[PDB]
Every structure is written in structure tokens, then in C-alpha cells.
Amino acid sequence: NIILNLRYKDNNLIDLSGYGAKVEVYDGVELNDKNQFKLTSSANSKIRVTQNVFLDFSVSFWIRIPKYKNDGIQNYIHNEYTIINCMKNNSGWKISIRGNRIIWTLIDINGKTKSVFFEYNIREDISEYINRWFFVTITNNLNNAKIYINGKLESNTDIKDIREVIANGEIIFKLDGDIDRTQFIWMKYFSIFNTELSQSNIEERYKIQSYSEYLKDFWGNPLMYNKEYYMFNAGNKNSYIKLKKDSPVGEILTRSKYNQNSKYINYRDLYIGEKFIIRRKSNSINDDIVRKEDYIYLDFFNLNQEWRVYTYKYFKKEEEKLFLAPISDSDEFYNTIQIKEYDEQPTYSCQLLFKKDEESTDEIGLIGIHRFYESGIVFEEYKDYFCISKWYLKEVKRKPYNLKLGCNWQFIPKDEGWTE
Amino acid sequence: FAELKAKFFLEIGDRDAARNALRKAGYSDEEAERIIRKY
């Protein structure tokens, strides 16, 4: 039921539908072999698709929309811009964005218009949508326009009043509107179908196009070795790891927040805590992507020295503080971590299992966060620390898998799409 | 590093393991004990 299927092949985009649409990718479009493409604000950043009665039809694609600039928030909220336009004789459809809102507009032959949209929150401590790959699907039948986000129905618009909408027009991928120079958009897997896709089908496609042998970072891009990452905890979203002053352990602190006074904006800072870096058991090499079940060392930088995250071999309680220390071999600690992804649903979270070596059947425990007793004349009697725990060994077997377990981590690199 | 070890064990409330790590370095159980009372 596919009538257009844009995919990457050899530094270009082509139609694989077999209906042979002509695709002109202009020099302003950045492409990669992960099928991601980038529309920027410069004039040559566009794609023209020339394709060879009331018709049901559906569009799906992935999109990654960058965070607002804090100092440019008014126009982000105010200014709508088209990113994909498909019109003939002033009739057709368009996909637009006005700030934190993505919009689907239908235009009949008479110019009569209807829209359906999805809006995400820009006051969330930590957002699931901002500058993160998510999945979009819009369906149209005789009576309704629907938007699905990540397989789930989000909005519905009655389009009974509309009239014949012309669909054969050329499709223009280009940012069009009163935008800032720094504005851009990433897209992936653009598709069009000659039927209204059912919620069941969208969900299956969501899961299938979510599949990868590799792991992903917090933004949704492939997880990499030898790349600097801040760490996020899905069970403790506002917390972060810092090497404790004068002690070789990771204390856990609360993220700082947006500290100015725009009334449209709130978020927690993401670029804080230690800069971690994932290495290889053996060991630095070109574009090495991290895969499920890989064996790694979890390292980080401490004043131009590379330190590593250890566990004591012989910890006595159900959980214990991790040891953060220089790279060294020791009879007393494990350093071998196996990176895991226990969730069976789409996710960017992973788990970090300590192990004896690469051949062992023994599971020592999973890295997470726990509260420990503070001795002496202190403020608080308990404090959060960067830990290993045997308890998660039990909890990761429960089904369905818990998205919010404190043994679920994501890795956050600096990214042009998030500034704070 | 050996000193980071000892500091680690005090931080996890394992004062004996700390003495074990220092003596392994290896230190005098008197100097070692002072080091500990100091941290």
C-alpha cells in the first residue's frame, strides 16, 4: 500500500516504491547512511519530489526537532514554518511547525482548510520529545485526520466539511517561514500510503523501524565508543553523577535548572556531571558503534587523566558504592561491564551489568542509584550515590519490563540541537 | 591508587579493608592507623 518510499542510497534519496518518483536532493541537504536527512535554513537545503475523488491516505516519518533558543523563545512560539509542502492549484497538504507544535493541514479545491496537530510540553524537567527522534504517522480517510506519535493516537480532526483534496502535486521538503538562521530539522524514513493505516499497523511499523542491532544515545542516534557522554537515569531523571570531593565515589546531585524568567520555558540542565566515555575491553577506532551485549569499560575524565568505574568484588550488603578511580589492575575490583537492553518495547535506555570477565556465567549486579547512611554531624541521614545492586538482577526479569527502573541509563552527548 | 582504595573502604564504612590495603602497600600499622583517623 506504499506509493512513495524515500530512502537513502549512495549519497542520495530515491523512491523504492516501484512507482518511480523523481527525487532531486539539493546541496543544502545533509545525508547519512542512517537514512537521516537535514533541512537547514539556507536556500539550497531542499528536496523536490515529483510523483508520477476522495482517497484515503497516510504519511509517516521520524523527526527530530531542536530545542528553542532561550533568548529567541518568542518567535519560536509565534512563528509557524512549513517543512514539507505538497500543493497543486492551491490545494493539497502541508506539514508545519510552530515551536513545540507539529501541524498537519489539508486544503480542498475551494481553499477550505482543516488541521490536526501534536504539541509537546516545554516546561518539562526532562522532555521525551525535544531534540529527540520520535515517530510520526498521519492518516486520512473520508471523515477524519489523525496524528499518531510513537504508535499512539494523539489527535483527531473531523474533515467532513472539507472537499476534494488534490494529492498528485510535487512534494517540497524545505523550511519555509520566518525562521532563525540556526533553525533546522532532521527527518528519516519518509513514506506515503494509499490507505488509512490502522493503529495496529502503525504500532508494528513503529516497533520495526525502532529496531537496530546497535544502542542509542538520549537523542536517539547510535551509541558510540570514544565519545563524551553525560549520564541520565530513567528512574531518577533530575539526578546526576559527580565525583565526590576527596572521595573516590560518585555522589548524586540534583540537576540545575533554567534560571531566567521566560514564562514559556522550564527544563533541567543536561550538560552536567562527569563526562563519561565508553571504551572497549580491548583497546580506539573509527566510527565504532556500541552494540547490545558488548563488553566495555565505563570511563571518565578527571583533570586530563582517564579514570574508570569499578565495583568492589566482595561487597557485603545488597548494594554498594561504585569505586571511581584511575585505570589500574587490582585483585580487589571488577572493571568489566556488559551493556544491555532488557526492554522489549522501543527505548533509548540501557543497562550496565558488572561481570568477572567476558566468559563468566556469574552476574555481579547492575549499576544504578541507591541511598546510603551518612555518619557524623551531617544535615541528611541518607544520601544518594552511584551504585551496584543485586536487587535489579531480580527486577530486570519481571515482565513487562519496567521503563522507570533506576538501573536504566541513557547517554547524552553535546548536540547542536540542545543549548542551555 | 592504593590510597584511593583505603579511602574507598572508609567511605563504604569498612575500616578493616582500609587497613588491609595500606599494609599491602605496604605500611606500618601505626602510620596506617593515623592515616585513617586523619581522613
| 8 Å CB contact between A388 and A364 | yes
Same domain, A248 and A286: yes
Chosen from A323, A373, A375 to mutate, greatest number of chain B CBs within 10 A: A323
CB within 8 Å of A162: residues ≥ 6 apart: A106, A108, A112, A113, A114
Q: Do A373 and B13 touch (CB under 8 A)?
A: yes
Same domain, A192 and A232: no
Q: Phi/psi zone of residue A148: left (φ > 0), alpha (ψ -120 to 50 degrees), beta?
A: beta
What is the distance between the alpha carbons of residues A383 and A29, in angstroms, rounded to a whole number? 49
What is the distance between the alpha carbons of residues A8 and A241, in angstroms, rounded to a whole number? 39
Same domain, A240 and A210: no
Same domain, A179 and A268: no
Q: Do B7 and A247 touch (CB under 8 A)?
A: yes
- Beta strands A409-412 and A228-233, pairing class: antiparallel
CATH number at residue A177: 2.60.120.200
Same domain, A114 and A163: yes
Considering only CB atoms, which chain B residues are within 8 Å of A248? 4, 7-8, 11
CATH number at residue A241: 2.80.10.50
Place of cell 531566567: A260
Same domain, A24 and A143: yes
DSSP labels, A58-114: EEEEEEEPPPPPGGGHHHHHH-EEEEEEEEETTEEEEEEEETTEEEEEEE-TT--EE
What is the distance between the alpha carbons of residues A323 and A303, in angstroms, rounded to a whole number? 17
Integer CA distances (angstroms), A308 to A63, A137, A325, A340, B21, in order: 35, 43, 6, 19, 19
Same domain, A235 and A209: no
Same domain, A163 and A273: no
What is the distance between the alpha carbons of residues A89 and A68, in angstroms, rounded to a whole number? 34
Considering only CB atoms, which chain A residues are within 8 Å of B7? 246-248
Q: How many domains does chain A have?
A: 2
Q: How many CB atoms lie within 10 A of CB A419?
A: 16
Same domain, A254 and A343: yes
What is the distance between the alpha carbons of residues A265 and A283, in angstroms, rounded to a whole number? 43
Q: Hey, what's the cell of A283? A: 583497546
Distance from CA of A410 to the nearest CA of B (A): 26
What is the distance between the alpha carbons of residues A263 and A123, in angstroms, rounded to a whole number? 9
The residue type of A82 is T
B2-34 core/surface letters (b: 16 or more CB in 10 A; e: else): eebbbbbbbbbebeebbbebbeeeebeeeebee
What is the distance between the alpha carbons of residues A385 and A244, in angstroms, rounded to a whole number? 9
∠ at Cα A93 (A87, A99), nearest 5°?
120
Angle between helices B15-25 and B29-38 (to 10 degrees): 130
For this experimental structure, what is the resolution in angstroms? 2.8
What is the distance between the alpha carbons of residues A332 and A313, in angstroms, rounded to a whole number? 6
| 8 Å CB contact between A104 and A145 | yes
What is the distance between the alpha carbons of residues A130 and A120, in angstroms, rounded to a whole number? 8
What is the distance between the alpha carbons of residues A396 and A228, in angstroms, rounded to a whole number? 27
What is the distance between the alpha carbons of residues A214 and A212, in angstroms, rounded to a whole number? 5
The residue type of A248 is P
The domain in which residue A408 lies consists of 218-420
**CA-based nearest residue to B39, from A247, A242, A384:** A247
